[PDB]
Structure formats: C-alpha cells, structure tokens
Design a protein around this ligand. Sequence first.
Ligand SMILES: C[C@H](O)c1ccc([N+](=O)[O-])cc1
Ligand SMILES: [Mn+2]
Ligand SMILES: [Mn+2]
Lengths: 137, 137
Amino acid sequence: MLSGLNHLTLAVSQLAPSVAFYQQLLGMTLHARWDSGAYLSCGDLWLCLSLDPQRRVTPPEESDYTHYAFSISEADFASFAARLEAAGVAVWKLNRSEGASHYFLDPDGHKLELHVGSLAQRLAACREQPYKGMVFF
Amino acid sequence: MLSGLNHLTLAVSQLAPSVAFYQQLLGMTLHARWDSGAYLSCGDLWLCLSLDPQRRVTPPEESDYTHYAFSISEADFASFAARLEAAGVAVWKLNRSEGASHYFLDPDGHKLELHVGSLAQRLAACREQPYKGMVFF
Ligand SMILES: C[C@H](O)c1ccc([N+](=O)[O-])cc1
Ligand SMILES: [Mn+2]
Ligand SMILES: [Mn+2]
C-alpha cells in the first residue's frame, strides 16, 4: 500500500534564490544542486526544487489554500517565526485556526507553515474545540 | 530548527469525491471529517483536505511541476498503478528517471506520483551519472 510521502517537489522560477531560501533561511540540508534543480532534506523529508519556466510568482490572494507545513518544537517556534518576520518574509495568514502555526510564503509564493504538534495532538485539541460538523473515526 | 514535514494540505473543490479518492481509492486512513475538510494519514504523512471554493479543477498543462509523491514498494507498484488505471485516473507524465514512478492526477488536478526509492538511492544514481551542472555537498 502507500506508506507516506516519498518526496515533495516544488516548481521554482529562479533556482538560486529558492535554494538560498530553503537552505540558508529555513536551515534545510542541501545535498546536491544542478542547473535545473536541487535536492534538500528536512529531517526525513526529501524536498526537490525544480526549475520550471512555467512557475509564476503568485500572490497569496491568487492561490488556493494548498500549503506545506514543517514541524518545529515548542521551544524553537516563536524565535524562528520572529526571525522570518524580521527578515521580511511575506505572510499569508494570521488566524491560528489549526493550533500554533506561522504562515509564510517562499519566493514564488508557495504557501508554507511552521507548526507545533502532531496529528494526534491536533485531533485531541479538536475534540475540545471541534470544527463545525466534525466527526472522529 | 525544522524537523520534517508536519502536514500536507490540499485545497479541494468538492470534499466528498476527494475523500473517496484519498481514502477509498488510495487507501489512506480517514481520522476526522468536518463540514469543510478532512484529516487522513498515510504512513507518517498527515494529509489535510481543505474545502476551498477558490480551488479550480486544473488541467495538467495549466499547472506547474509542483507535485506530491507517495512511497510504495517495488513489489506493490504495478498492481497499484493498475488499480488507478482501472479507476480511470489520468496520467500527466511518463517515467524517464530512476526508480519506478507513476504520475497521476487527483480529482482537482493536483499532481501526484507513486515512487519507489529514497533520496539516498537517487543520490547514488546521480553520483554515477550526474545531471548537467551537478554539484554535491
Ligand atoms: C550562482 C553560482 O552559479 C553557484 C553558486 C553555488 C553553487 N553550489 O553551491 O553548487 C552553484 C552555483
Ligand atoms: Mn496547515
Ligand atoms: Mn517526483
């Protein structure tokens, strides 16, 4: 059967600024780069950045809610979010509707998130403060 | 420090066919559903489906190469691909890289992939036959 996410591939319009964002600013590990892409890891996540002439720099009001959240500990969350803010990283959401989260954009407008907590923790939180119509299986 | 992918959220235009696709066709575990979304898991992956009236059913020629690959074993690959084919799921790309891959579309045009093989396997293949301009770190 399917066993998890093998990799996340993000199309990018300019390879070098995107590598710098994920490696230098977000601290991911860069394993290789080539003329049209790069391979990084973030813990067990395999991230591929793929140079794509079709990728457009997309304002957050023009894209849907599809987004990619990265795990961070409770101890590191606030200072990492504040560092992104001080570095001028654009945002896209302010209301914490799914717990402790910081919502920010990559150079092409990919919607990213820092989040503290697991699915199990979110389900437990939702039992106390459920979303409208929520059912648990 | 970021420790992994916390969750993947896909905006969907119609919640019921998306739940059917991810839970029933793709075999993911449904943990909760509410009026405007659902939480599923696939191995370690926390997947959120978020009902979004801004999501367009998007032909693959009109979206960039951003895509989401799920892990499957080599032994299970061919029968899972055949299941998707029987269900009429559209393919958006043929495989031309190392490791088995099946490139398929979700009901809204999200670009998905079944892939066999790890980052370590890919890096090993690349060291033997580097892409144009490839540098390792
Ligand atoms: C911008 C310049 O071409 C360049 C800088 C750095 C790398 N690298 O670390 O592999 C590649 C290419
Ligand atoms: Mn999220
Ligand atoms: Mn891929």
